[PDB]
Structure formats: C-alpha cells, structure tokens
From a paper:
Using a chimera of phosphoprotein residues 1–53 and full-length nucleoprotein, we purified and crystallised the protein and solved the structure to 2.19 Å resolution. There was a single molecule of the N0P chimera in the asymmetric unit. Residues 27–447 of the nucleoprotein could be traced, except for a chain break between residues 352 and 399 that remained unresolved due to its being in a flexible loop. The structure of nucleoprotein contained the N-terminal and C-terminal globular domains that contained multiple alpha helices together with a central hinge region that resulted in it having the jaw-like structure typical of Mononegavirales nucleoproteins. The phosphoprotein chaperone module had good electron density and could be traced from residues 2 to 40. Its N-terminus appeared to be essentially unstructured and was followed by two helical domains (Helix 1 Pro8-Arg12 and Helix 2 Met20-Gln40) that were separated by an unstructured loop. The structure indicated that the interaction between the phosphoprotein and the nucleoprotein is mediated by 13 H-bonds and three salt bridges, with Helix 2 of the phosphoprotein being amphipathic and forming a large number of hydrophobic interactions within the binding groove of the nucleoprotein. The ABLV phosphoprotein chaperone Helix 2 occluded the RNA-binding site and interacted with RNA-binding residues Arg168, Arg149, and Arg225. Phosphoprotein Arg12 forms two hydrogen bonds and a salt bridge with nucleoprotein Glu403, which would otherwise bind N-1 Arg357 and Arg361. Despite the two different approaches to generating the N0Ps, the ABLV and RABV crystal structures have a high similarity (RMS 0.69), giving confidence that the ABLV structure was unaffected by the engineered linker regions.
Numbering used by the authors: 59 to 97, 171 to 496, 544 to 591
Write the structure that this text describes.
C-alpha cells in the first residue's frame, strides 16, 4: 500500500541499474576465494589520480629492525610505530612481476611485466624522526635474518590485525584455533620458524587494539591487495590480511550473498525488494564509477586504505536491505543472521514482516508478485505460522544484545 509496492512497478524502473550482475559475481567469487585464507556517505572512487598514502617515521635498517621487533614479540612488548615502519620497509622483500596491466581509479599501478612490490600500490611518506628500535633479552650480536625469516615476522605481525579484529564474548576458543593455525603456517616452509609455540597469542594480548590503528590497518590492506593480484611464494601472509577485503561493506556483501543463496539473478532478486525504502538503498550500492565489478580494484580494500570514512555500503548505510536479508536468514535458521546486529533505525518491524513472507517463500529451496499478493491479503501482518517459526528459531537460541534473535524474542512471543 503506502509501505509496499507492486513488484510489477519495480520491474519497470530498476532496469537502469548498472553492472549489478557483474558486481554480484565478482564479489561472491572473491569471498569464495578468500575462504582458503580465512580457514553524508562518501564514495571511495579516487578522483585526483593520487595513490592512497600514510606517513611513518624514518626508514630503518631492515636487519636491525627485525632484531628489535623479534625481541619485542618474544617479550610481548611491541611498539606499533616501529612495527608499521618495519612492515612498510619490508615491502621491498616481496617482489613479483605484474601479470597484466593494473589500473584502478585512473591510477596506473603497473604495466604488464613491471617488477612490483606492495609499495607500488601506495605512497608511504616518511619523516626524518628515527624509530625507537629498543632490544631486550641481551644486546649480544646475532646472525642476520634471511628473507624467509623476514617473511615469517611480517606474516606474524600482520596477523595481529586479524586477531585484534576478533573480539567479543564466546570468541577466544575460536581465536585460539586461529592463532594456532597462523603460527603453523609461518613456521612451515617456505616460511621459517622464528618464534616458539604460543608466542603469537601472548603477544596479541598486549596488542588487542591494533586493528584501530589506521596506519597498521592501512599496511594490512596494502599487503592484502598486493597478494590478491600477485601470486607470490609468501602469499599465505593473507591469512592475517584477508579480513581487510570488503571491510565496512557488510550491506553490499549481505546483498550479493543473499542473491546467491536464493539462486536468482540480481535483476530478478531485486523484484522481491518491494518495500518502498529499498530503492534508495539499492541505487546507493550500485552508484557508477566505483569499480565494484573490476578485479583487483582499490575498491576491494577501500576502507582499510583510507579512501572513505563513511561507507555507502555498510549495514547502516543500507539498513532496510540489511535488516530484511537477515530476518530471512533468521527464518531459515542461519546462526550468522540470528547473531547479526539489527539496524534499529530502519523499520525492523516491517522488515521482519516481509522477512517472514520471503522466508516462507524460499524455505526448503514462484514469483515476487505472489509474495506481494499474500502480504497485502493479510493486511501487511505476519501469519501465525510465520510468528511460530520466528519464535521457534529465536526462543531456541542464545539471543545476543541488539541481535536479530533478541529482536524476534521481544517482538514475537
């Protein structure tokens, strides 16, 4: 009525959407590939032909920097300014050949055949202020580190980004398993064992906030962007940096993953989004010029690289779409949706109503118009079967605060 629209009208007016299919395909494929490593709004497109940049202190001698940091790693005392400075200087050790011309947002990163490193992707300015480079456990001279040892330290340090991002209750056993697997990777060829078991977790306990240090996040995204494009001997370093891909794009990513889950084209799936507020949010996600369908674009790491502070692709940015997708997920009994956080300011009651009808529509693997018809025939209200299912899934779950499951328990019971 005044809240919902006939999908026949959405079918006429959503044909302007651009590269929506290609975007869904690329993002879903990238998410799939990333699994091997895992186990007011400002659009990101660069307009001035300058690479992303940060500022660090004066470049250190790599061998001296390695020895200082490895000593800090064993003592669970790392200086984050020194670690960033070392990580940026270590980029020169990760050299490959660009397999094809690499351009993003009008910036020619490299031409086919160019020798490139992660430093090619960004402008890292440096002051003339020396880092601290303190060493403990005795200042006795030690053998110079090999490249493989540098690669292990780089990988271990960068994994503190991923470990820092993991936070919340009932997450430290998962954190323990992740830490253990990361340690194993970086003590297994082509990497070298440079620390004893359980050192990473002890270090992370003192570095738990590092994911909120912008320069460190920036460096993690730079390495991840580089290893995504350039196959490299030490590419497994992405076990720590893969989490920078599509950061703060949980609305767009929920949308693309939702389209794949219901096995529809983006053109057809959009027809089911027939609540009036969806249109603005859907056009927000497919704004032209952002390279959402371009492989290896800066777009994939735009949040970590500082291209935008207010993502148009976040769950809040498209809260109605996001709420709807995860109420459907709740109806389907998907834990990821039950524990997701509701966008309180995006009509979670109406999204839960449409979610119940769509959940019923797709349960167990029919047209958008039929669904619209059923909702209207019930006066825009959930049926008792819907509510029973919603309660069945939520009352039988450990509803987290502000989660979709908690919303269902308080709203339907």
């Amino acid at each position: 009525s005044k809240i919902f629209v006939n999908p026949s009208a959405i079918r006429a007016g959503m044909a302007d959407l651009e590269m929506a299919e290609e975007t869904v395909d690329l993002i879903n494929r990238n998410i799939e590939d990333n699994q091997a490593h895992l186990q007011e709004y400002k659009y990101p497109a660069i307009q001035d032909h300058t690479k992303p940049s940060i500022t660090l202190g004066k470049a250190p001698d790599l061998n001296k920097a390695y020895k200082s940091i490895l000593s800090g790693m064993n003592a669970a005392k790392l200086d984050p300014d020194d670690v960033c400075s070392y990580l940026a200087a270590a980029m020169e050790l990760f050299e490959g050949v660009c397999p094809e011309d690499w351009t993003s947002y009008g910036i020619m990163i490299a031409r086919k055949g160019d020798k490139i490193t992660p430093a090619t992707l960004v402008d890292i300015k440096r002051t003339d202020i020396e880092g601290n480079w303190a060493l403990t456990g005795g200042q006795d001279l030690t053998r110079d580190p090999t490249v493989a040892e540098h690669a292990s330290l780089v990988g271990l340090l960068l994994s503190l980004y991923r470990l820092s991002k993991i936070s919340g209750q009932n997450t430290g056993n998962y954190k323990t398993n992740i830490a253990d697997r990361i340690e194993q990777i970086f003590e297994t060829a082509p990497f070298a064992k440079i620390v004893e078991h359980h050192t990473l977790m002890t270090t992370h306990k003192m570095c738990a906030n590092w994911s909120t240090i912008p320069n460190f996040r920036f460096l993690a995204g730079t390495y991840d962007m580089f290893f995504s494009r350039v196959e490299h001997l030490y590419s497994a370093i992405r076990v720590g940096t893969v989490v920078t891909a599509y950061e703060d794009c949980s609305g767009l990513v929920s949308f693309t993953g939702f389209i794949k889950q219901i096995n529809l084209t983006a053109r057809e799936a959009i027809l089911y989004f027939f609540h009036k507020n969806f249109e603005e949010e859907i056009r927000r996600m497919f704004e032209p010029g952002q390279e959402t369908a371009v492989p290896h674009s800066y777009f994939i790491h735009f949040r970590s690289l500082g291209l935008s502070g207010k993502s148009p692709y976040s769950s809040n940015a498209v809260g109605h779409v996001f709420n709807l997708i995860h109420f459907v997920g709740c109806y389907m009994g998907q834990i990821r949706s039950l524990n997701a956080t509701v966008i309180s300011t995006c009509a979670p009651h109406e999204m839960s109503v449409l979610g119940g009808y769509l959940g019923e529509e797709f349960f167990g693997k029919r047209s958008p118009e039929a669904v619209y018809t059923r909702i209207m025939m019930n006066g825009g209200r959930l049926k008792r079967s819907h509510i029973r299912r919603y309660i069945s899934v939520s009352s039988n779950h450990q509803s987290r605060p502000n989660s979709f499951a908690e919303f269902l328990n308080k709203t339907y019971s």
